[PDB]
Design a protein around this ligand. Structure first.
Ligand SMILES: Nc1ncnc2c1ncn2[C@@H]1O[C@H](COP(=O)(O)OP(=O)(O)OP(=O)(O)O)[C@@H](O)[C@H]1O
Ligand SMILES: [Ca+2]
Ligand SMILES: [Ca+2]
Lengths: 29, 360
């Protein structure tokens, strides 16, 4: 019933890094 | 396309929400002659005739002029975006002072003219990246180490623990013990070699004394390291003596508790009814948690401290040196997050203190 409740549910069911666009890192660490 | 900027004591991680990794990672440094200033890697690639300054110390922004240079360099030089066209998610350390987060907001809206922004707690984002909204995060980077227990997206401030030792201290300690072995690492270029040895060959022993005995009676734990010029040196028990400091800070003269003990103390400061879920959801994040063997050692040490019937689980994702950023990339690309942004319209009405009402 709260927006925060829906957001937390969305975080748990997001698939994690799996559903994020594969990009290349210009990593200069 | 919202932006995600994860500002650390040592490294900036920046990219676009929805991507699986930051587009740009570069040192959080500004350099001046020993042109006017050099920011990021051009300061790094000139680490020899400039004096470097770190605008973030122990996870806290302390030099706001140089931090502005970092943010300008991130937007224009690295991401190649106009900040006026992109909502920008920023990250903060646990227990970041109210004045700091308010000035973060003011600079974003008034100096960079972002249409919207947000400030999230770094350890919370790392928990999100692992698909969790309850758990306890061990976040260890370059300047600071934190234990952050989290209940349904909310950090529990009274139970947050801190250890003021992280990757930079470990690099310095590996430098110290390699020189006690007979090597010389004095130049800035040689310090970067020590950091590379640390990140490539160091590991956490399951038991310090057993491992020392193995290294004393055999060559089985020794590794070859080829310097950039060509010389090959041998690394022995320094491989695990260096990160042992995380569990035994007295190796560098700190009487603080090690990371297994700050984790246990953090859980014990939480309400008893959530401790079971915390013990089963220990998430490791930050570059200094990357050592091989660290999860198995934490499991052993926490098991020794916790009730014998408690289920202990250490989660150490392979991407955890970018877990904070990935968590921000996930959060900022969720449709339910749209109403959470601080809009420039909201900033004009309330002012910089709007961050206290919208970011928590
Ligand atoms: N594979 C590895 N093994 C050990 N240490 C590593 C590894 N990779 C990176 N590190 C260390 O992690 C540190 C930087 O990590 P991270 O980006 O999490 O810190 P930060 O966000 O810049 O600083 P902080 O979080 O303390 O403000 C550096 O000291 C680096 O040497
Ligand atoms: Ca960090
Ligand atoms: Ca001690």
């Amino acid at each position: 019933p709260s927006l925060h409740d829906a957001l937390m549910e969305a975080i748990r069911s997001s698939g994690g890094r799996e559903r994020l666009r594969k990009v290349t890192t210009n990593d200069r660490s | 396309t919202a932006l995600v900027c994860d500002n650390g004591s040592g490294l900036v991680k920046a990219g676009f929400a929805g991507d699986d990794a930051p587009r740009a990672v570069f040192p959080s440094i500004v350099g001046r002659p020993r042109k006017d200033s050099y920011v990021g890697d051009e300061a790094q690639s000139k680490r020899g005739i400039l004096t470097l300054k770190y605008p973030i110390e122990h996870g806290i922004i302390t030099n706001w002029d140089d931090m502005e240079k970092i943010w300008h360099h991130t937007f224009y030089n690295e991401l190649r975006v106009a900040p006026e066209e992109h909502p920008t998610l920023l990250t903060e350390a646990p227990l970041n002072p109210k004045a700091n987060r308010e000035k973060m907001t003011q600079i974003m809206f008034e100096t960079f003219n972002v249409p919207a922004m947000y400030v999230a707690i770094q350890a919370v984002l790392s928990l999100y990246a692992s698909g969790r909204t309850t758990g306890i995060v061990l976040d260890s980077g370059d300047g600071v180490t934190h234990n952050v227990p989290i209940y349904e997206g909310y950090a529990l401030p009274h139970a947050i623990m801190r250890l003021d030792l992280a990757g930079r201290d470990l690099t310095d300690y590996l430098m110290k013990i390699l020189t006690e072995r007979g090597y010389s690492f004095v130049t800035t270029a040689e310090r970067e070699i020590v950091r590379d040895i640390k990140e490539k060959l160091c590991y956490v022993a399951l038991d310090f004394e057993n491992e020392m005995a193995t290294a004393a009676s055999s060559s089985s734990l020794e590794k070859s390291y080829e310097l950039p010029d060509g010389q090959v040196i041998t690394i022995g028990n320094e491989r695990f003596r260096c990160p042992e400091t995380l569990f035994q800070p007295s190796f560098i003269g700190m009487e603080s508790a090690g990371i297994h003990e700050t984790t246990y103390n953090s859980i014990m400061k939480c309400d008893i009814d959530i401790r079971k879920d915390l013990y089963a959801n220990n998430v490791m994040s930050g570059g200094t948690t990357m050592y091989p063997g660290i999860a198995d050692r934490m499991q052993k040490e926490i098991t020794a401290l916790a009730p014998s019937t408690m289920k202990i689980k250490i989660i150490a994702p392979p991407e955890r040196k970018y877990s904070v950023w990935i968590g921000g990339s996930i959060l900022a690309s969720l449709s339910t997050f749209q109403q959470m942004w601080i809009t420039k319209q909201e900033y004009d009405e309330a002012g910089p203190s709007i961050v206290h009402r919208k970011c928590f």
